[PDB]
Enzyme design. Sequence first.
Site, mmCIF file in Angstrom:
data_model
loop_
_atom_site.group_PDB
_atom_site.id
_atom_site.type_symbol
_atom_site.label_atom_id
_atom_site.label_comp_id
_atom_site.label_asym_id
_atom_site.label_seq_id
_atom_site.Cartn_x
_atom_site.Cartn_y
_atom_site.Cartn_z
ATOM 1 N N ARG A 1 0.827 -1.201 0.000
ATOM 2 C CA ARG A 1 0.000 0.000 0.000
ATOM 3 C C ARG A 1 0.866 1.259 0.000
ATOM 4 O O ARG A 1 0.566 2.219 -0.713
ATOM 5 C CB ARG A 1 -0.967 0.003 1.189
ATOM 6 C CG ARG A 1 -1.917 1.184 1.183
ATOM 7 C CD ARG A 1 -2.809 1.207 2.420
ATOM 8 N NE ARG A 1 -3.398 2.535 2.566
ATOM 9 C CZ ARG A 1 -3.524 3.198 3.713
ATOM 10 N NH1 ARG A 1 -3.112 2.665 4.860
ATOM 11 N NH2 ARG A 1 -4.053 4.417 3.709
ATOM 12 N N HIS B 1 0.746 4.145 -2.835
ATOM 13 C CA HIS B 1 0.380 5.538 -2.576
ATOM 14 C C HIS B 1 1.492 6.537 -2.860
ATOM 15 O O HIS B 1 1.214 7.690 -3.181
ATOM 16 C CB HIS B 1 -0.193 5.713 -1.176
ATOM 17 C CG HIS B 1 -1.642 5.364 -1.108
ATOM 18 N ND1 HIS B 1 -2.523 5.969 -0.238
ATOM 19 C CD2 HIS B 1 -2.377 4.505 -1.851
ATOM 20 C CE1 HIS B 1 -3.732 5.470 -0.427
ATOM 21 N NE2 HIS B 1 -3.672 4.582 -1.401
ATOM 22 N N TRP C 1 -10.436 -8.390 2.547
ATOM 23 C CA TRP C 1 -11.228 -8.688 1.368
ATOM 24 C C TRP C 1 -11.427 -10.174 1.261
ATOM 25 O O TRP C 1 -12.550 -10.632 1.138
ATOM 26 C CB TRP C 1 -10.556 -8.160 0.104
ATOM 27 C CG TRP C 1 -10.655 -6.683 -0.057
ATOM 28 C CD1 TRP C 1 -11.602 -5.993 -0.757
ATOM 29 C CD2 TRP C 1 -9.764 -5.704 0.488
ATOM 30 N NE1 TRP C 1 -11.348 -4.643 -0.685
ATOM 31 C CE2 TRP C 1 -10.226 -4.441 0.076
ATOM 32 C CE3 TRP C 1 -8.614 -5.777 1.279
ATOM 33 C CZ2 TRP C 1 -9.581 -3.257 0.436
ATOM 34 C CZ3 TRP C 1 -7.974 -4.606 1.633
ATOM 35 C CH2 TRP C 1 -8.457 -3.362 1.214
HETATM 36 C C1 HEM Z 1 -9.705 2.072 -6.984
HETATM 37 C C2 HEM Z 1 -8.492 1.913 -6.446
HETATM 38 C C3 HEM Z 1 -8.235 1.693 -4.940
HETATM 39 C C4 HEM Z 1 -8.981 2.021 -3.870
HETATM 40 C C5 HEM Z 1 -10.313 2.783 -3.855
HETATM 41 C C6 HEM Z 1 -8.308 1.571 -2.677
HETATM 42 C C7 HEM Z 1 -8.712 1.714 -1.376
HETATM 43 C C8 HEM Z 1 -8.177 1.104 -0.274
HETATM 44 C C9 HEM Z 1 -8.635 1.262 1.097
HETATM 45 C C10 HEM Z 1 -9.830 2.133 1.565
HETATM 46 C C11 HEM Z 1 -7.841 0.513 1.869
HETATM 47 C C12 HEM Z 1 -7.918 0.329 3.399
HETATM 48 C C13 HEM Z 1 -6.803 1.094 4.109
HETATM 49 C C14 HEM Z 1 -6.888 0.782 5.582
HETATM 50 O O1 HEM Z 1 -7.983 0.968 6.181
HETATM 51 O O2 HEM Z 1 -5.849 0.357 6.156
HETATM 52 C C15 HEM Z 1 -6.862 -0.131 1.022
HETATM 53 C C16 HEM Z 1 -5.892 -0.997 1.452
HETATM 54 C C17 HEM Z 1 -4.959 -1.609 0.660
HETATM 55 N N1 HEM Z 1 -4.668 -1.292 -0.660
HETATM 56 FE FE1 HEM Z 1 -6.034 -0.322 -1.892
HETATM 57 N N2 HEM Z 1 -7.152 0.946 -3.066
HETATM 58 C C18 HEM Z 1 -7.082 0.999 -4.440
HETATM 59 C C19 HEM Z 1 -6.077 0.500 -5.221
HETATM 60 C C20 HEM Z 1 -4.985 -0.201 -4.778
HETATM 61 C C21 HEM Z 1 -3.820 -0.562 -5.568
HETATM 62 C C22 HEM Z 1 -3.613 -0.164 -7.039
HETATM 63 C C23 HEM Z 1 -2.991 -1.226 -4.769
HETATM 64 C C24 HEM Z 1 -1.620 -1.861 -5.062
HETATM 65 C C25 HEM Z 1 -1.281 -2.333 -6.261
HETATM 66 C C26 HEM Z 1 -3.621 -1.346 -3.478
HETATM 67 C C27 HEM Z 1 -3.096 -2.003 -2.402
HETATM 68 C C28 HEM Z 1 -3.646 -2.086 -1.148
HETATM 69 C C29 HEM Z 1 -3.246 -2.986 -0.110
HETATM 70 C C30 HEM Z 1 -2.169 -4.071 -0.181
HETATM 71 C C31 HEM Z 1 -4.105 -2.684 1.088
HETATM 72 C C32 HEM Z 1 -4.048 -3.404 2.443
HETATM 73 C C33 HEM Z 1 -3.231 -2.546 3.408
HETATM 74 C C34 HEM Z 1 -3.043 -3.193 4.749
HETATM 75 O O3 HEM Z 1 -3.409 -4.388 4.937
HETATM 76 O O4 HEM Z 1 -2.511 -2.518 5.667
HETATM 77 N N3 HEM Z 1 -4.831 -0.684 -3.493
HETATM 78 N N4 HEM Z 1 -7.085 0.251 -0.291
HETATM 79 CA CA LIG Z 2 3.947 10.633 -4.019
#
Ligand code: HEM
Ligand SMILES: [Ca+2]
Lengths: 267, 267
Positions: free
Chosen positions: A31, A35, A175
Amino acid sequence: SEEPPFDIRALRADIEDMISEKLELGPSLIRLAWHEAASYDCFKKDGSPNSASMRFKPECLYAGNKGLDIPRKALETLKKKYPQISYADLWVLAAYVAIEYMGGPTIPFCWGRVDAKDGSVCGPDGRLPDGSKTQSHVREVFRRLGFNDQETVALIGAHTCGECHIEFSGYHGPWTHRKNGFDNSFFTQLLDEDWVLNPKVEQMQLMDRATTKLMMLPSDVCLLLDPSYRKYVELYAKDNDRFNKDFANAFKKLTELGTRNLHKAPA
Amino acid sequence: SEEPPFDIRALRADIEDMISEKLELGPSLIRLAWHEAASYDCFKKDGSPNSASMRFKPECLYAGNKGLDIPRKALETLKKKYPQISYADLWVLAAYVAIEYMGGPTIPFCWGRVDAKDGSVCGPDGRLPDGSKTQSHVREVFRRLGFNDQETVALIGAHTCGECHIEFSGYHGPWTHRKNGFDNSFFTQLLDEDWVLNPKVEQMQLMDRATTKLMMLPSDVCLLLDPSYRKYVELYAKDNDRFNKDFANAFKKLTELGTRNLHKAPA
Ligand code: HEM
Ligand SMILES: [Ca+2]
Ligand code: HEM
Ligand SMILES: [Ca+2]
Ligand SMILES: [K+]
Ligand SMILES: [K+]
């Protein structure tokens, strides 16, 4: 190809050790790298992606970056042990290590990114995607980054890993059934489950009717709703090999946005 | 109380006749009056609510007002027959007639609203609520209008009437099983059904698992998700009488926002 100024073999081993001690770090590292890249606008050619600019205000305080201090601080310890690596290279390398650790592809690493030295190079707020929004928003963001629909779907497949935290995004839970495992499970469940409103979480998210233990955001299910995205969801649900290859390519592209003068690492 | 300058008895009869000839006009008349009021900001005391300002650019072209030319044009015919009524009073009266026509409360009407004469008094875009958003947004909008949570929930209960049109909002279909009937069915179904993703509509909306023929928007189901709103959903689901009374009071308040010098109509 070219030997880096840091001991990459030892650093990789240390990243792996760090993850082994706290497995939930793996997905947060992914993540973080995402970002740090997601600030890019390919039309304005700004946003200083892949420069570790998230270390500074104002970017560190953007709502979409909440909780990313955790993987940043974890990596700080390794930066001190391997001072020759830039934060920017370190965040990318750690994400590649995490992806492999969890069973995903081994992505060829290039080194040479230079760190942002202050927050003046930070891109503006509002460039990170919003989980409460759907395909018009998702497509606009990924088009801004320079990705096509295939790459967009592959990248969002990273939600196979990790979980949402109420404290960070207001959403709750993993998820997939195996949040520390990387595979095409995000796509299989998108197609195979019945996604029903979860009445227990104040921020609207869906859960699977079968167990209620899986979740999806509006931004995840929009991949089902959009005719183009759905084709790739179907593709990846049927073929984990293709998903792994496509994720590798897209993630490498993502972490090389706005970069120059990189060097292939020894592997 | 005070006799209006138009023949209100005859006008009411003509509105009823118009609705009888095209029943789907009923809910659109309610939507029209609501969007003409929804421009208000009670803190800035601007937006010219209840002035028929929607007749003019730029307000007529706001995305949230798409399709409202239909009830406006329908009412134009009656404006010509009863030229002494302002468009503003006519839109409110027609909504009150429609609410009663469909089995809802008979709301005491006050007349005397003065029409906006040009578009310069139009409030800005962005004041209408967005169906794709949830309770933070809904509460902000209704707080801006001056409504509390009870009134907010009562008003949104109007979705018992009518339907979404792809051409206007991108959403599709009626909320309830009897779209030309007014009652507390919106609340009963919110509580009683299992709301599952509708994979057939590109704009994210939910459908009932039982029949798939009912729909809910994200903004509708947020009334279930929010602890305060949910209490009123429960209240109205159990008591149609209370819902009718509360809707009457809230809708009267809505259609009197930003008004002065009104007169009680003969009834
Ligand atoms: C439409 C695109 C995306 C949306 C709306 C989105 C949104 C989110 C949100 C709301 C979370 C939860 C954060 C938290 O509460 O800790 C999250 C976690 C995460 N995102 Fe996404 N994300 C998107 C795309 C991506 C992409 C492109 C990647 C990497 C290639 C990614 C990788 C991750 C990972 C690995 C987590 C888990 C983090 C953890 O377990 O601490 N996301 N994302
Ligand atoms: Ca940046
Ligand atoms: C959170 C607040 C609200 C949201 C997000 C919202 C959204 C919508 C949307 C997207 C439509 C479909 C328009 C179309 O496609 O034709 C609609 C229709 C409608 N709205 Fe709402 N609305 C809200 C509040 C209200 C209120 C307060 C009222 C009246 C008291 C109301 C009355 C109606 C009616 C009667 C229709 C049916 C129109 C027809 O059948 O032509 N809505 N609304
Ligand atoms: Ca208005
Ligand atoms: K997984
Ligand atoms: K109804």
